[PDB]
Structures are given as structure tokens and as C-alpha cells.
Amino acid sequence: ASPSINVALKAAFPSPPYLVELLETAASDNTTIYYSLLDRIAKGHFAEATTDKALYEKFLEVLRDDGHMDPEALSAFKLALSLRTATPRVEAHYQYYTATVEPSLSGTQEGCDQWFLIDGEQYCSPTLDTSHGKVKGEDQLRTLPFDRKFGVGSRDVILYADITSKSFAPFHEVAMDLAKKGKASYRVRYRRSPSHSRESLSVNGYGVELVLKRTDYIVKSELAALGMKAASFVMQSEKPFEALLKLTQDFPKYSNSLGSQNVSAEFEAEHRGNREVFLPEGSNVLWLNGLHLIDRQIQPFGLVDLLTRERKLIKSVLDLGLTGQQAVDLLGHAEVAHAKSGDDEPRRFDWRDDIEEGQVIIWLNNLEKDKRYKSFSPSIWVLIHHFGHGLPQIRRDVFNLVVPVDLTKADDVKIVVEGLLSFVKRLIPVRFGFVPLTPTGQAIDQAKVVYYLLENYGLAAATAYLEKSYEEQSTGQPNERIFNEVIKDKSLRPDGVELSFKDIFISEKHEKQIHLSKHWVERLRAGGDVPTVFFDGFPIPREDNWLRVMNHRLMQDLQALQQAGYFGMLNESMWLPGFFLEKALSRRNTLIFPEDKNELTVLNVNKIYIENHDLMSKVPVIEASKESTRDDWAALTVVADLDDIEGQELVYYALRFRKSNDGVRLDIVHNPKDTSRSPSVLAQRLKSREDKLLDFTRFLDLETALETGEFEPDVAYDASLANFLASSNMKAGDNFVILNGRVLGPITSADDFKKEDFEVFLQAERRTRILPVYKALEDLGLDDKVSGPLSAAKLTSVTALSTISDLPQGIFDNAPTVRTTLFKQWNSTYTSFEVGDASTATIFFVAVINPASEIGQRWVAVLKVLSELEGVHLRVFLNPTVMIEELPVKRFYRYVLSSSPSFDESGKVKALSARFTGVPRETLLVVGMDVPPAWLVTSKVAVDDLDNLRIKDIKAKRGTEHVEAIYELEHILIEGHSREIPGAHAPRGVQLVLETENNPHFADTIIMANLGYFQFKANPGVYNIRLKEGRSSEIFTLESVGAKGWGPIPGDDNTEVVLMDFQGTTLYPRLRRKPGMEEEDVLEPEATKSVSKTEHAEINIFSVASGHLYERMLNIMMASVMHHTNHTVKFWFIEQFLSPSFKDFIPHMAAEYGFKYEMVTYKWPHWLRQQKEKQREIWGYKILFLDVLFPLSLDKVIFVDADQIVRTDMYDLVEHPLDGAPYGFAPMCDSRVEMEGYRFWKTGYWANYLKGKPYHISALYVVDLQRFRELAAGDRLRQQYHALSADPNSLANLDQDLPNHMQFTIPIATLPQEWLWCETWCSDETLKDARTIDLCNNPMTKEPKLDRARRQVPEWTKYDEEIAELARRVREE
Ligand SMILES: *[C@@H]1O[C@H](CO)[C@@H](O[C@@H]2O[C@H](CO)[C@@H](O[C@@H]3O[C@H](CO)[C@@H](O)[C@H](O[C@H]4O[C@H](CO[C@H]5O[C@H](CO)[C@@H](O)[C@H](O)[C@@H]5O)[C@@H](O)[C@H](O)[C@@H]4O)[C@@H]3O)[C@H](O)[C@H]2NC(C)=O)[C@H](O)[C@H]1NC(C)=O
Ligand SMILES: *[C@@H]1O[C@H](CO)[C@@H](O[C@@H]2O[C@H](CO)[C@@H](O[C@@H]3O[C@H](CO)[C@@H](O)[C@H](O)[C@@H]3O)[C@H](O)[C@H]2NC(C)=O)[C@H](O)[C@H]1NC(C)=O
Ligand SMILES: *[C@@H]1O[C@H](CO)[C@@H](O[C@@H]2O[C@H](CO)[C@@H](O)[C@H](O)[C@H]2NC(C)=O)[C@H](O)[C@H]1NC(C)=O
Ligand SMILES: *[C@@H]1O[C@H](CO)[C@@H](O)[C@H](O)[C@H]1NC(C)=O
Ligand SMILES: *[C@@H]1O[C@H](CO)[C@@H](O)[C@H](O)[C@H]1NC(C)=O
Ligand SMILES: [Ca+2]
Fold first, then answer.
1. Which of 479, 1079, 1172, 1203 to pair with 1290, CA 20 to 30 A apart?
2. Residue whose CA is at the smallest distance from ligand 4 atom 8
3. Does a structural domain hold residue 273?
4. CB 1305 less than 6 A from any atom of ligand 2
5. Closest Cα partner for 1099 from 1131, 1123, 1134, 1124?
6. Do 1065 and 1111 share a domain, yes or no?
7. 277 pocket-lining for ligand 2 (C-beta < 6 Å)
8. How many whole angstroms separate alpha carbon 1148 and alpha carbon 1161?
9. Does residue 80 fall inside a structural domain?
């Protein structure tokens, strides 16, 4: 009605049938709901629903009536159905079917609408008599992400069906029954149904913004009160949530309208008592049950997935009679969070030689007897009376450091010789030791050599051999030429026991010493890929700057000694290192104590005993004792292959451990490697002997009990068994241990997990997870709700999962995964308002919004729709700032989202749009899309200039006050963060190729230095990532694409990526270097040009335009090139900054002028610093992404500005020698003399910085892309831009200023000035020899660009007329 603007978004793929969408949305994770519904529709039950509304209506009654959903879950189903979350999941099936099924299915298909696939044979009938084909191509038995399985069976059957028709129902029942019998396992895959049309999909869950492009006009500056008055207006209204939405959506319009009718109502200067304690004014912060959410997680898709995960967690808890409110309170409790932070409590391991009889550690020091430290006092009070920054001097043994070193490796040897000795020489009060690593023959020999040389001759002689050997010989294997010289002089007085010389094979020296050393390394797991250093029994892995970390603990240990001294705990007759070893463990388990602390897996216990009840009621169970306490209670489950020694060894130890601990409740799950013989037999053998369990005096009693007895197969048991392992992601024949939901394994050798190792696992686990749950729980007085070991495990397991990081630490935010309760302190009467019932709510939201913020605009819109869900509680806090330097909100905002689907008059599903009403007639606006992270969007239909919108002009020109535009969700991102193995660094310069069965080259990108970042533009389907052929595959092998998580998670040893969601795909790939390489991709160890020219063109020019004029000028620029060269040209454009009017026109320009064109884009990385102003974005696209924006096949490109015109045959620029420089620019004209005043690059900062170098122009330049990438110029530009950008007034014009700031670091080839002309800075005499002309800014005039063109260049009109006639010719065509 009022003058309005309407914007809609549609996907790049057609809308799947509504029926299949409801099936998938309804049965999210649950297969039972899936096939239970698949039965209902195969009855022909859902055939009477003629329309989408009716069909949707029928599902609601069914789900409620069959017990599938409750109100909470039904409300959530409607919102997820609005979002159309299941549509990309269905399109995954179709892309897979179109690209891998159809080309591998040889024959003539007609009548084969549905067909099972069995043993590479296709059957178009349920009767199964005839096989049409032997299917070619790769295996279709890939158990892949979108699959579902029904039943267990030796044979595997797949049905590719078009569910829509009733031709489907008989096929289903044939395999449903065959799976019910157990003959084979059933799974359904989809077929694109021809009953549905090729209508594109209308999407929602995005935002639209109308940005004011002129903010320059402000006079009166009483901005300070806006946030404060805006906050009060809402509190006053008494319909507060609606006020905020209405105010926040059209905020720029209401600025002057605020401050009316004694408006301040500052009761709430009182609630800065709230500010005083916790958050600073004007900051937006959201919490979900204590969890702090980052901005990227605050979209509809991100939020729906969080509720889904959180409810599953809470529901499990409230089956013990806890309210949603009590449950959440327990999760964010102080004692709980303290335990997570409780790795300030360090655990130490006993580093001593005492077990290995003193023959393994070779110390470089003794502080009590070295006559270096002779100066120092051997008194305790020296330690206690210390102040300052210095480390206390003392003649006593107090601090120790043992570093395991490989003597083959020069890097390892250099550590001892340079690193360790400097410290000795420096007179540090730390004793330095080292133990050789013996993983190769050469290493073993050199340990012998060095050990011998110490034994008879002494430390200096051994030291001497190492020092000598390192310098140049850098010996892998022992060298006599160097060894014998050492003895020749250093063989003076080799004391005590006599020499052997040259040859070592001493029965005791080789055996005892080397094997004792191996026993030490093994005992503390101090070896492998990454060795482990032990400082005071504290493991520090040998990586990056471990000394930095060691020094940190050295100061933290010193302060630990001082405090004991002031309490008089210490005494003069003491071994001070033993203060730390008091509670140290002799053996170190990498399973329990992984050095990457994040490496942890916990399962929902409630889930395990709900889904697999059939299995868990039939496993041999030892219930915990009747006379045992809540503290003693713990639940253990052992998963082991009883067909292997390791598997049965492990169980005997678990049984032994149970005799000792009466509080434990044990379960034994037999997981065999071979499932051709039923697993139920060996389980049945033990459950008979269950009563007599742990009366096995000896191990053979268990061995014998497993072998004896005759049993049938419970095939029901077998099925639930295989389901459990699949749910728990466990391999067959692999050993695992589960105490209170926490899984450790796979156990390679049962010697790793002994009786003593179960006791520690319970000791440590108990501490962290069980004792903080017990305390916290009791503090709230909920300690009546724990009724047993299994009852307890459900609570402890759930609260450990609550503090689980889904997003790896260090990527999106460094801050740890901790639930705060710190906002509960805050008074709420005058700043807060709540929505939803707290008593019933399972979800609790705490929003802290600043009304004056632009981020608040989005937050309000999304929160209102999620508040509409049943079982959700929200509480809002408004916190504005008094510090407002500039206008706070400079845009209008609308969020396209509904809490339940909308239907047509003809019953179809309604599409959703952003409609802005009551738009000011004379304000200039810019349309922008506030799209979820994974999405790539461009304008498809629009007749207006979306960069320059004004209603008065449109009304005058078109006659309409109403504007309509349509966008397209063209691509969805596959983005990931790489790392090298084992010394994890980002592998920069690595090239990647994305592929599909149809084509082996979907896309290509290069790995960046920052987070090993990379991205691909794709849509739903099954893909694969291969390292690009060349140097990348030569140096590396990629073990995995981290699709499962950071991991390594077992089963992720793959390179397969699939996208079936609107959140795209986030990956954490891993790459390990090939045999002994220190090589770099960027550096070579020839037909590189020809190739690009053949594929693309003789000339490759790229550009960008942000307005109808600039697009009109761009048409002229391209034409001028074409008239001026009889060569082949390819034009490249930055896709998203162009209008659809321009986009729709170019094929007609390409036909006329005879050139090729290609649209390119890259999404601005999340880590890289954004640009609020679009003009600045555009400049960034020209300089920051040059290496990644164009395909690797392209040798070189040339940038030409839109306003330019060229009289030259452009090849010349290609041939121009750049003398090994990545890119070439043209300098600023010095020819105009009278202009000097406006030459600002002869001033202090630019003349000081550019000592002799020129001030270049970014209107035209060459980029030798192959060299650019080779030199890794892009990553420097990116990181310097990010660093420089922290200062807002940094780069006036970043495009010109970044290459000029980087010309010292990155060479710039300077171009002949024949290459550029501009009236402003070049003389009129110069134009005769000019090659190209930029229309640079006035600035001594106000004459506009249209005027300069016609006056400056006479042939500009000739070009404009040619374009004008063709546009009219197309309009009439
Ligand atoms: C995956 O799939 C399914 C479906 O979403 C989830 O589990 C379903 O939940 C049903 C209950 O809501 C369950 O019904 C149970 O039937 C068994 C007998 O086979 C009963 O022993 C159970 O009793 C428990 O639940 C009831 C709930 O109220 C029920 O009472 C009326 C009585 O007239 C019943 O007619 C009706 O089923 C009501 O729901 C409690 O009152 C009891 O005290 C007791 O605790 C259930 O009634 C279904 O068998 C089950 N499957 C389906 C297809 O519905 C499953 O949890 C979900 N899991 C995941 C991982 O998502
Ligand atoms: C939340 O609102 C309450 C409202 O009262 C604020 O309470 C403050 O509490 C202290 C004492 O707890 C009050 O003053 C002191 O009281 C004692 C005993 O009556 C008296 O002996 C002292 O001399 C002193 O007067 C204080 O006045 C009161 N504040 C106000 C404004 O009344 C609380 O600080 C608020 N907190 C937040 C986070 O906003
Ligand atoms: C590109 O090739 C064409 C030949 O097709 C050249 O065009 C000739 O130019 C004169 C200009 O007065 C015309 O009168 C002739 O009729 C053209 N020849 C033909 C065959 O029609 C053109 O000059 C070449 N341009 C460049 C830059 O190489
Ligand atoms: C209250 O009302 C009017 C402005 O609406 C003004 O006359 C008066 O100064 C305002 N403030 C106070 C404290 O009375
Ligand atoms: C104090 O001296 C005693 C010997 O009298 C000895 O146990 C130890 O060195 C000190 N005591 C403790 C508890 O460490
Ligand atoms: Ca320009």
C-alpha cells in the first residue's frame, strides 16, 4: 500500500516433492520414525492428500497419534519444515543418482521406474526373475552419510525409488519382509520423480538490508542519548518485544522521532550496577543454557541444530525427575565448571631410572657436586627467602629435565649440543638429562657408542664425540674416523672398569643398557611421531617452543615450593624433587592421558540403554554391590574380541578389578572380528556362568568357560549388537573400555590396559566427572534422584557432553567451552522482559542486546521466531552506550523466516519475501543480503539499480512506487582447515582438485597459510578431493579430509565429501609428508603459457563495475579493446557486483565482438577482516584474492578499470618483460607541471616511505599469476591488509596503497608511461603517444565523468552508439 520494496531468494536446484520432504524432516536422526512412516505411505494412506497443506495436516495427526512427537517436538518440526532443511538432503540423492547411477547402469531403461540392486544386478520387478544388467562403475554399497539401514543381513539390498507413485508400495513390502526375516539389510535411495515439475525452490532463513549510502549529512549531534532513550521507549510501550522489532527494523527513520514526551525515564541508571559487575555498555551477547554463542551460530539453521542437540541432552536428564530449570542449573554449576578448568591441577609421572637400575639417563649436570655451583649454598632457606625475577641459586637437586633424543637425527642431536649445554654453561639451577631414542638400527648402535664412552672415559669424552659428530659429519651411524680421534687425546685416564674399544656387542652394555632404555621410553610413552619431554614429571611434547612452556611450569613449581616452606612442610633432610613425585604414577597411559587434552569421546548413556535394550539385557552383567555407597558407584562396560588373546586378557583384568571395587557395575560386550559365526554364542556361554563370574582363581578358568557349552544363535541379539557398534562408531574385532560413557580405545595390546590401569581410569574419571556432579547435584538438593550405578552414569555422562566443543578451539574463537551462570547476579526489573513459561521450558535463552546496534536488528528478528516455539524461554537485557561518535544505525532490516509453514489458496506452500513498507521517497539506498555463512548469492531478476535506489526516480521513470528484485542461491560452500602431520602446521601453496564421478575436475583452489584455509563453490551431492597432480602429490599424501571433526576420529581415513545441508560442509583435512621431505611446493625442483591461451584466450582481461553507468562504461572499454586488436580475448568479471541487466546482456556482446567471458567470485573468509563499505569491498577483491579467484590453468591476467578506454593492441602488455616480478603497474604522471600542489605522494609519509620508489596507479596492471602464486604474494597481501586494517584511517584507496606499501617486500615491475594517460596529471602533448586513458577524479573541477568522456575522447560516442543500437536490436529481437 505505502511505497514498498520486495526481495525474494530462490535456489539453484528444483523443489523436491513435498511428500519426501516431510518424511525426511519428520524422521531427522531416527530411523524407526522413517520406516514407521514409510509403511504408512506404502498402505496408500497418504494418497488421499491432494494438496501440500492437506498432506502437511495429515502428518501432524499421524505423528501425534503414533507417539512419534510431543508438543515440543511438533513445534520444532513445523519451524524446520518452514526452513526447508530437508530439501538439500533429498537433492544429494538425485545428484548422486544422476552422476554415478545412470552412467554405470548399462541397458535401455523404460518401465524401470523402481529397481533393487543385488550383487551388481538390477531387477525392475519385485518378482525378481530377470536381471537387466551387470552394473559398471565404482561400488554403490558405500555406506554413505544420507543412507538408512533397516535390519541386519548377510546380503545387502538397495531400492532406488520414486515414492510419489503407487508403483512403489509392492517393491517396499518385498524387502521390508525380507529384512524382517533377516535374509538381508534394507536401505532406500531416491530417484528424481517425473510427477513433479522443474520449478525452482524458494528459500528462507536470510536477511535483507537497505543501506543509506549518504551518511555525510549530520549537523544535531545529541547522539549519545539515542541508545538510552530508545531502550526506555520499549520498556514504556508495554508490548515490548514488538516495539523493539518495529523500532529496530526501521530505526534510521525514527532517530529524530525519539526524545519525545519526557522520554529518558532513567529509572535504569540503577541497572548499571549490572554494568559495574559484568558487561560493558553497547555489547551484544547471547547464551543458550549457559553456552555462549558466537555470531556465526546465530542464524536459523545454526540455532535449530543447537536446540535439537540440547533437548536430546536434557530429556535424558529429566527422566530422573528434574525440571528443565533444575537440569540447566546443574549443568552450569560452579563445582562442574571448576573441574574443566581444573587442568591447572597438574598430573605428574615418575621420570626416575630407579626401575631401570640407574642405567638409562645420561645427565650433563649434578648440582650438589659440579664445582660450577660451588659458589652456591646448599640450604633450604635459600629457596624460601626468594624475591624478584631471578631463579634461585642453590647447591641442591631440585628441578630436573629429561628429554628423549634420537642420535641419528641432526635436529635432535643439535638440541643436546646447543640447547642443553648452553643452559649448563649458563649455571641454571636445573639438572639436564637426556635419553636416546632407539627406533632404528643406527640409533641403537649410537646409543651403545655414547653409553660406552661415558662408562669408561667419562661425560666430556661422550659429549666430545657428539659435538664433533654433529659438526658437518652430522653422523646417522657411528663413525670411527671421528670416534678414534676422540679416544686418541680424550682417552687419557679412562677410570675404573677397563675398555672394550671399536666393537660393541657387550652382553650387558648392549643388552641391559639398550633394553632398559627402551623400557623407560615405553613406560612413559615418551616416543613416536612426537616425543615427550618430562620436566619435574610433567609431560611436555617436543613441539614448537616447549622450553617456553617448561619455563612456565618452572616458575609455577618454584612458587609451589616457597608456600610449603612458609608452612614448614619442608625440612633439611629431604630430596626436593620427591616433593613432586609424592603422588606421581610410575606408568603413563596415552589413552587416559592423551597429550592433546581435547582428544575425548563420550556417549549418551541413556541412549545406549534405550536403543539397544535387547543387547544390554542379555550381556553378562555383574551388578554393583547392595552394600555400597553413592561415592563408590560407577558403571563399566568392556567391549572385546573374545576370539583373540588381547580381547580375553583385557576381560580377565576387568574381572580382577571388580573383585576389589564392590561399587562398580560391569558389562561384557563380545565384539568379534568375524561375524560369519554368530556373536550370540560366546555371550550366551558367559551369561550362564554370570553368577560364578570373578571366581576365576586363574586365567585358564575363563579360557575354558568360553570354549565349553552348546548354544543356539539369538539372532535378535546379533542385530542389536551391530547397531550398538555402528551408533558408537566402533570397528569389528576392536577392544574398548567404557566407564560412565567415556570410551577409550581401540586397545591394540591388552598389556596397555591392566587391572592397575582400570583403577587409575576410575580414580581420574571419578575426580573430574563424577565428583563435580555429586557435589553440585547435592548443593541443589537433587541427590535423591541417583538410585544406582547406571542411574548415576546417565547424569555424569550427560554433563560431560554438555561441555563438548563442536567447533574446534582456535578457529572461530579461542575462548573455552564453559557454561557461565554469571548473569544470574544481575537485577532485572527495569531492563528485562521474559517470554515463555520457565516452569515448562527446556530451552533457556539470555539475550543482551544494544538497541542502537545494527547486529541487534538481526538478533531481535531471529529471537522472536524462536521464542514462538513451545518449550522455549527467553529473557532480554537492553544495554546501550553513551559513546556515540557517529550515527549508530545506518540501514533498514527485514528477516525472511516463519515459525510454521504458510499455505496457498490452491493449497501449495507459500514462498517467503522481505517487504519494506513506508520507504522515504528521496533517500538513496543500497540493497544488501545478510546471508548464512555457507551461502553464495547474486541478483538474478531486477530492473532497478540496486546500488542506487530512489523511489522518486523510479516513480518518475517507471510509474511505480513498488520495487521487486529476485536473487539466486547459486552455490553452497565446502570450506575447511588443513594441517600437516605430525608437526601440525598449515601446508601453504598446496593445490587441491574437487571431483565427481561425472567429471574429475569440478573445481580447484590453493591452501592458504591462514588456518590452512581453502574453499569450493558447490551444490548438494557426493564429491571427492584429490591433491593436484604435480609438486603437491610429489611431496604429500593426504590421509584424510576431516569430515568427522578435528579428530582423528576412527573411520575418517577417507577423502569423501558430501553436502546435504544449508550449513555446507566444514572439513579438517590432514596431510603427512612423504619420505624425508623438507621441500616446499612454491619452489620448483614449462608448457605453462600455451596451455592457458589454448583453454582461455590470447589476452585475459578482468574488471568490476558497481552501477549502471560503470557497467555502461565497461561495455565501451571492452569494445575499444576489440576494435584495437586482431587477437583472441577473454573477459573476466567479479560476478556478484554486476546487475542482472548487465549479466543478461553480455552473451549478445560476445556474439557481436567475438570474445569469450567467464564469471568468477570467492567468498570473503570468516577470519579475514571485512569491509562495511561496499566500495572498499570491491577494491579488496581486486588485490586480496588474485591467486585464488582465477583457475590454476590461467597463466596471467590484466586488470582494466571500467571508466577506461584503450587504443592499443593489448597483447603488448602480456609480452612486456616483468623481470621476475609477480605484477606490473604504471606510475603517476609527472608531465603536468602546474598540478604539483595536488601531488600528495611527494609529502612526508609517502616520500619518506617510498624513498626512491614510485607511487603507482591501480586503474591498470598485469599479474603473472603463475609467479604470483609461486612467490606466495597473496598471503602476504592478506595478512598485511588484516594488520593494517585495525586502524580505520589506514588505507584511503587500498587498491593503490597496498601494492605501494608492499613494493619493498613484493617487487612491482614499473611500466612505461605510454601505458597511461589522465588529463588531471598528464600534459596534452603526452596524449599523442598514450596507449590507454583513465578518467581520474577532477579535483580542481566538479566536471562529471560523462562530460570528461565526450570532451576528452571523441570516439567515445562512436562506441556508445554501437552498444545503443544493439541494445535496441535485442529489445526488438
Ligand atoms: C526414535 O524413535 C522412536 C519414535 O520417535 C522413539 O521411541 C518411541 O517412543 C514411544 C513412546 O513415546 C514408544 O512407545 C513405547 O511402547 C513401549 C511398548 O512397546 C512402552 O513400554 C513404552 O512405555 C514408556 O513410555 C510411556 C509413554 O506414554 C505412552 O503411554 C500410552 C499408554 O496408553 C501408549 O499408548 C503410548 O505409547 C504413549 O507414548 C510412559 O508412559 C511409560 O511409563 C514408559 O516409560 C512406550 O509407550 C515407541 O515404542 C517408540 N517408537 C515409536 C515408533 O514410536 C525413540 O525414543 C527415538 N529415539 C531417538 C534416538 O530419537
Ligand atoms: C540490585 O538491586 C539492589 C536493590 O536494593 C541493590 O542492593 C544494594 O544493597 C546494599 C546492601 O546489600 C544496599 O546498601 C547497604 O545496606 C546495608 C544494610 O541495609 C547498610 O548497612 C549499608 O550502610 C548500605 O546502605 C544498597 O543501598 C542497595 N542498593 C540500592 C540502589 O538500594 C543491588 O546493589 C543491585 N545490584 C545490581 C547488580 O544492580
Ligand atoms: C584487423 O583485420 C581487418 C581485416 O579483416 C583490418 O581491416 C581492414 O581495415 C581497413 C581500414 O580502412 C578497411 O577499409 C578494410 O576493409 C579492412 N579489411 C577487410 C578485409 O575488410 C583491420 O585493420 C585489422 N586491425 C588490426 C588492429 O589489426
Ligand atoms: C517535561 O515536559 C516538557 C517537555 O515535554 C518540558 O516543559 C519539561 O521541561 C520536561 N521536563 C521536566 C523535568 O519537567
Ligand atoms: C622431615 O624429616 C623427616 C625425618 O625426621 C622425613 O620424614 C622428611 O624428610 C620430612 N617429613 C616429611 C613429612 O616429608
Ligand atoms: Ca579509474
1. 1203
2. 262
3. no
4. no
5. 1131
6. no
7. yes
8. 22
9. no
